[PDB]
Amino acid sequence: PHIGNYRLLKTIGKGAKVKLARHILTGKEVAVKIIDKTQLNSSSLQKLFREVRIMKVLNHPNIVKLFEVIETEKTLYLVMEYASGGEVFDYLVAHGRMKEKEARAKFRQIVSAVQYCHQKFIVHRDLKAENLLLDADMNIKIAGSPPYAAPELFQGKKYDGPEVDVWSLGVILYTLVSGSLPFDGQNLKELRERVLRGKYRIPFYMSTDCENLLKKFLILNPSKRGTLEQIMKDRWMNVGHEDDELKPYVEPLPDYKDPRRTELMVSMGYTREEIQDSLVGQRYNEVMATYLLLGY
Template sequence: MVMSVKTTQPVRVGFYDIERTIGKGNFAVVKLARHRITKTEVAIKIIDKMSLTPDNLKKVYREVEIMKRLSHPNIIRLYQVMETQSMLYIVSEYASQGDIFEYISHNGRLRESEAQRKFFQIASAVDYCHRHGIVHRDLKVENLLIDGCGQIKIADWGFSTFFQPDGALTTWCGSPPYAAPEVFEGKVYTGPEIDIWSLGVVLYVLVCGALPFEGSSVQVLRDRVLAGRFRIPFFMSTGK
């Protein structure tokens, strides 16, 4: 008598075997997966369309459209999009070394020379986006990933949008500690200036290992941002 042994088959999405969860959101989960043939590791963002409002679903499709247009060595690459009546699967490049926030949490602030190299990559990618009429609007260290070669990859384009040089945007979005003064004041903005302010906050975090603007409430944070109150640590170089 030959006994049959049941083996657990991996969950598959298209040509990808799902391995584990690497991120969760309100309406989506991100899974690490591996291509069945090439064995390439990828990140698959799985979105339940039925749980989204029409407006939020429209934003998801805009995110996909923007990712399709982006091709830069320091931006997470979109590989494939699969869709059913109820689900959306966004397959993208996997950055195996986590994000800058995790890196600083474990290793402390970056040396200024290292921060300079990392920031150059970030600024190069953001400049590329702006030259192509795209603004990210949620730049923060949690959205700056590190690949297996130590290169920066900008991720999470959920708040990104298209802009016109003579146009005006009004949406409040992103993380308050990285928000520009005009956002706190409810003013209209073109787009790039919001990213540029956030870049300044990111650079401060890279060099100092802490946020320049913090507060016990959004109101306190707003007051400090509008007043431009932040400290310059003793260990920062003078630039001479």
């Protein structure tokens, strides 16, 4: 069922297909987005190319790593890290609310990841529980949307900046510890009325710290919103981590010269030469893909 070096196995998403697959050369499992470009309107094509630019650049243990991009005139393939544990939504529906200790663990990962995005002036602009995935080890991997929307969407304000993500993150925290959305309703006009006033139900079991942290995210006025760096200093964020406070993620420097992997690739028939070129050039080709994939 071959494209590049990948044995396709089950589909796992449709609507653009997502196939789970084996990298022939390393035997590693990965997910392959298959995208029919011939079917995409102009601004979908925009958002696709953008997504791709961003994919290429983020390197955080809780954002899904991109491995390979195979472009053809009609079809684009995005080969990427596969989160076996599925959505966080699912897990909530499944086991109900998270105890605060667990929400915190997931949530540190979440805030870290989005802060990292921000360092690179990337805003996710549309976060949801449908975007938060889980690996084998219950780690977050970042990959419908009304109840996440910031107030400014319903005031026709500009909806451009980082503070959009901050509001979002408030909703996510709230869902993570309560098992439900802080602003709901059976229709858009209710939903909006509720988002705009900004009040939300405080569940009786919720710790006061938790509620204090919510108040740092869900502030109505955009320009009065914390940065994620500031929020990163919050007490609830840090309970259980008295020594390793959440600080902005620092990504580690590239290493395109790993002898372990280079040797293995040379066997495979790759040249030290191209291996270098592809890595330095950040080509995301079969050579880059392989090197990265052997990192596992």
